[model samples]
Target: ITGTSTVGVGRGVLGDQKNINTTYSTYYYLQDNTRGNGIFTYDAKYRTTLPGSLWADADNQFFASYDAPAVDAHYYAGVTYDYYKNVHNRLSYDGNNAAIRSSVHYSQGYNNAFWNGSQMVYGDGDGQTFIPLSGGIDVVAHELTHAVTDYTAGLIYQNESGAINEAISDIFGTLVEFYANKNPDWEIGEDVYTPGISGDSLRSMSDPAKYGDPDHYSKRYTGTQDNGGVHINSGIINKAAYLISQGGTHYGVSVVGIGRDKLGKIFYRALTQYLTPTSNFSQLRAAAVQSATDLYGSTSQEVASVKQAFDAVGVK
Candidate 1:
């Protein structure tokens, strides 16, 4: 979900200011169930101007236009809703009946996508470099996951918390993609970028080092670029989760194997049920191992592998 602009800033910079303003108001109105399906209008004088203009129109019409891309955005939103419900038994983004809201074609030639606190916003891309952001399910899920992190761990947006936030998003985002029967590899945003792009994928879960970086944990792995490198250092935890589930030798540790489903369940329990906002890598490692041990007992191979994976990443 890392993209070109901050959530509020991007909205202000694209399209007709008035039109975008009304459209966002209308979107929120509809999403709140304040209006039913049909055309509705509000006084422009009473409406507040949206943050910015895209391509210099003060009344951008596309935000109100219900087009194919918007349709896809809605479809993916619904799919994301279903994926969490069916896979994890979670009700909505907040684990309650919170309504889902989405905005498509957010900025003119905007090159990124994101999930703000309450809703998902997508860009049409610069076209030459990127395509419509709504075209990919993984991207959609990745953004929504930000909301999930907000609700659960409320992971701080910097340092290890940021990395954990991004790692969990990447993990579940890929799971949602796999749940949709898309390519199950660790590649992120494989569909959005143009073919001419040198790298075929945005992020690599299976092998982070393949993208010209080290895998596993290191003290030097500080949050700097990539939003505290949450999207980058996330490789450590992501690889751990991947190897634990795939039953393979970890990057910097000995071989350990476990059924993917069982391991996933253990981590899910720990993440959703035990960990708190202040939880760190060490705490998460302990919580996950404790969860595994509780579910499968101390002697179970799953518990051993969970601990081994953490140790592999330099977690004591």
Candidate 2:
């Protein structure tokens, strides 16, 4: 049976215009430890704990003992929503008209999170190694950015295009984290995994090599991984984008730098306003450089740096 619950819906094409000033509680009900048998929903009132027989489900998993998953999800969603509107001037996902819907506590002990065609689905951690996936900002942004990518480039999830898709998510995801200043430092997934782990995150935008790997690109980068290692090899483009925005030497070789905001604007312009579904690395490089030149001038230092950064990343 399906249960219905309504939060305050507001005016706007997507109804995301309503400010989330009020906090809400959430919980889950399980008959047995089997998939699709549990019911998860938000509480009608705001509070720290769920009502009787209701177990709090936040990280997309039902905890025998409750933590603040709903609170975390609410804060994360609010921050991501604010980031798109305040930083990028975009209103919600799909832009045309769509209120973003997010689902947490999707399954028991599920470690990964993903966006379905319409909404985001988060997992409660397996608990042996991680907490619920919804506990952090980068994870939330990363899932939402997948929706953005699906709408924007629709980048084929294979080969270089797939890698670019993954990179774009990490790029914007990190930007959202930095924009929110949720964590003082700018490492991705730093807060999701248990602190007992040796590494900080799944990927590092500032220095890709810190995670026990080479930080530079090679011709033999993509093969025999998820859509050509789209997620793994994304480090190449993520680092390139970060270095380009901050103005620094990339992989200790190609020198580049631009005003971070300006560089981000150029890339956004190129991605949303110009690039197509089939666009690849070279196409992105050309489009971003052109956008930079158009906005700043063909000979502007920013344009030069943008072009140089792409070249250093072997995007030519």
Candidate 3:
């Protein structure tokens, strides 16, 4: 895959034109060497394989319908990489500029995307439910944030720790969405979910209950499903994160808005410094409080808002 680095034009899953970083070695390959190590995109060919063939185009122009998912996956991975590097000063997911890899068109009628602990996998959903998931920058960032969580917090993927893991992804995903500033909203997967519908997303950081997710710790799901309600219970922490960035009164408790940059710094510090594998909801609150204290001092509004945000969400 070594060759002269080049840029190629392509259409993404939503039919929007984009320039993708490719390498030319006889043919154009979706391997971007501009970032840390490199950002590579692959084609799954509608199969359940891990990191299929590195996407190649004969003319270095990706306009075919089948090329849409690969286009978005590659482009968005680069955006997410830039977000982490520019915003958090982290080289890559592993902090070492480890090469980023993603495979699209994974399995027929596949409706989801995830980090397989090693690389990214995206399913081309049934058209009615979702388009190519990589089309959503938040979706791509959310999955890659899992890699960040794995390398940093190593939060156990079960119970309350798992909920924290999911919420961390949602928090950073929304931040990255805003960082890219493309129709930004505090909603997850809105860009790729339900083409036939409008204004709905897989989850909402502003209001989790709109999608039946708990917005408060008191209402957290204790069931064993979804790896101890990892996705479901994440709503509690997501709501807290939202309130910290954009202040609001919840359940009679109020939080002061501290803006997104400070919100991200506090959480990033907590994730990289304090969170452990078994850290639960209360532990997360403490970590955020301590993180705010470290960054903004104990008497700072950032610290106060971190406390009030968790209190508003019934975390403490």
Candidate 4:
């Protein structure tokens, strides 16, 4: 949308009113040109179409009850853009300030959201499982983080590498939740996950085992399901990340907590500089070890904690 940037107020799927970035051409469009080239949100209209019409509003006011997904999708994309640019000092997912694109209401009764290699795509859940997924900042950032992985590490979508990809998303998604400072917890998707089922999340970084996921490497799923358990085995890496940020002892192994920012820095460096397409769990250990050593001294507590966290997860 090539128009003047504007602001619009609307309510989200959770009924929380928020201000979102929009653009005014002939009519108001859900496009914000302030970040990078711009961040654009679209309407899928309950269809399986890719990137439906650019979201448009008549009066530059998106207060309609049906616009909840659009409201959060637009607002959260701006927040995620701000997060990377301001905190990481990188531009968008590609580190080049690439324009961010997202589409909401994709397909009927959709229960998941994903990064389709380039842009973010959200699903309006089947009511029993999820709501408008973009309503969760963590979910939005998690999908965007996949774009980051695509541009940086390009970790392959199979076996350990795929699990690494999933875990990286979960790690930064939780960090972004904490950065927002709004009832943040180690649980993922707790905000927009099953409303009917209380006190449950899509996943838990602090304790993946709570959701029947393995928190230790020895228990990793070796079957061919779920792309070799990309979502399941990621629990091991997720636990490692949690321990790195908030120290804990697991399976008689202890990790000294190094806090979240340092943990993000170490992982970010590894992803951007060291990892490859076929990088496995052992390879990730080396990358993190070297990344922490590069940012902090080799003998620093940061480096040691990185090692111990991986060890606690039995990654070595």
Candidate 5:
């Protein structure tokens, strides 16, 4: 809808008040025109559909309980956009300032969120197990990063390549969360998973095995389920990424911490310049090593640490 860009106030899923970018013609719609082409958020009305109706409110204020997810989806997408632009110097998801879009309230007890190769979709979980997913900035970033991966690496979503794809999303997801400075941690979906349970996330980057995911290559799941354990086997790559950022010792190997910024630079370089659709764990190691060498000299500690992190994870 064509309208003057406006700002609106709203509370997110956790009841935290924040401002959102909206568009105003007759009613305020959750269409942010400030970033890229635009950031558009929609209401799914508890149905399984792609990009439902554009959210509208009589007032330029969004405070209804039902409005919480849209508010976060809209605001967080902006944050993710800022992260890519400022940190990676990349425009929107496609590096062309593509329009970012999301839909919330996608079915009762949907219990999950995803990027369906087009737009972001969030499920209003069963409440006990999960909340409105967009409420978790990491979750939102994780899904959007899939778009980034699609546009760049195009990692085939199967076998080891798929695991790398999942891990890349998790990696950037954590980086984006850190960029937003919102209770940052080496965990995924902690903010939205298990309201009744305390101190638990869907997965852990610091210790993937905390949730029964393999932290080392040898322990990786080789089963056919989950597209060759794309989610489960991602622990190997996720642990390597965590080790690269925050040094750790695993299975008799030690990695010196290189911090998050360099970790991001190296991985972003690898994703954009080196990785391919069929890249496996060993190939990912080569990509990261080469990326680090490209950013820092061959003898630089960045390169060495990248090697040590992969070695510690048994990627070779």
Candidate 6:
């Protein structure tokens, strides 16, 4: 749907005003062609149906109350695209110029968002639990990274592989946050989590144990629920990634910080070139080590930090 690319001023879930990219055919539509071909956001219309409709406005300005989430969804999609292209030199989620599709206001008081193997879907929260999820770049980036993983590593969403997949999302999500330099931290979903809650988030990468998530392999969840505890067990790998970027000591084991650029370079390489759908934790360790070695010589501190980081988290 192309006619003319345009810009619209709108407020986001947090009541922050920002100009968003849009397009106008017969009616104005949420489509930005600036980043990697295009980014398209739609409206879910408070129903269970997906991607209900392409949001259309008579004017090119989006200032209505319902337009809040759509504005952020469209804008953040562009930011995530920027992260992949500028940082990793990849085209889009597919490494080709793939158009990103997203939907907001999915259902009544809905509180979660996900990548449905093709596009992104976000729910307007019940206000008390969450605001609009797209307001959080980390949340948007996290779900978009799932698509990135599906295209590259193809990590199956179950058991250890799923946990690895989840952590990869968390890793890149945080990276993209820092890339945007928008009050970034190692906390997952902190920006748009509970409305009244402060100093708490859905998950903690720096100190996963603070949220009852496993910071070490010894504490890995074994239940079959949550697809073999993909969310719960991901804390172990997330902590390892955190340790690599920011040195930490756990259970008497220590890791030296290698900084974020090298950390992202190694993990991005491992995901695209080395990891497999069935790869488990040990294989992930091998892939990370090999990726770090490929990027920086085997004896370099990058490789050493990666290894020690995983070891600090008891990865093997």
What's the residue-level lDDT of 278 in candidate 5?
A: 98
Query: What TM-score would every model get versus the actual structure?
Result: 0.76, 0.76, 0.99, 0.98, 0.99, 0.98
lDDT by candidate, in order shown: 0.64, 0.62, 0.95, 0.91, 0.95, 0.92
Candidate 4 TM-score, C-alpha based? 0.98
lDDT of 6 by residue, 21-123 (tens): 8888999899887887799899999997887898888887777889989999998988999999998999999999899999999989999999999899999
Superposition TM-score, candidate 3 onto the true structure: 0.99
**Each prediction's number of clashing residue pairs:** 13, 6, 0, 0, 0, 0
Off by over 4 Å in 4: none
Question: Per-residue CA lDDT of candidate 4, range 1-316, in tens?
Answer: 8888888889988888888888998989999988898898989899878899899899977778679998988888888888888878889999888999999999988999999987889999998899989999999989999999999999998999999999999998888888888788989999899999889999999999999999999999999999999999999999999999899899888888989999889999999999999999999999999999999999999999988888898988
Q: How far off is residue 227 in model 1, in Å?
A: 3.7
Candidate 2, lDDT over the whole model: 0.62
Pairs in clash, predicted candidate 6: none
- Decide which is better by TM-score, 1 or 2: 2
Error of 3 at 296 (Å): 0.4
- Per-residue lDDT, model 4, residue 263, is 88
Model 6 per-residue lDDT at 106: 91
Please give the distance, in angstroms, between residue 101's alpha carbon in candidate 3 and its true position after superposition.
Answer: 0.5
Q: What is the lDDT of residue 102 in candidate 3?
A: 97
- The C-alpha stretches of model 5 lying farther than 4 A from their native spots are none
Tens digit of per-residue lDDT, candidate 3, span 204-247? 99999999999988899998999999999999999999999999
Angstrom error at residue 140, model 6: 0.2
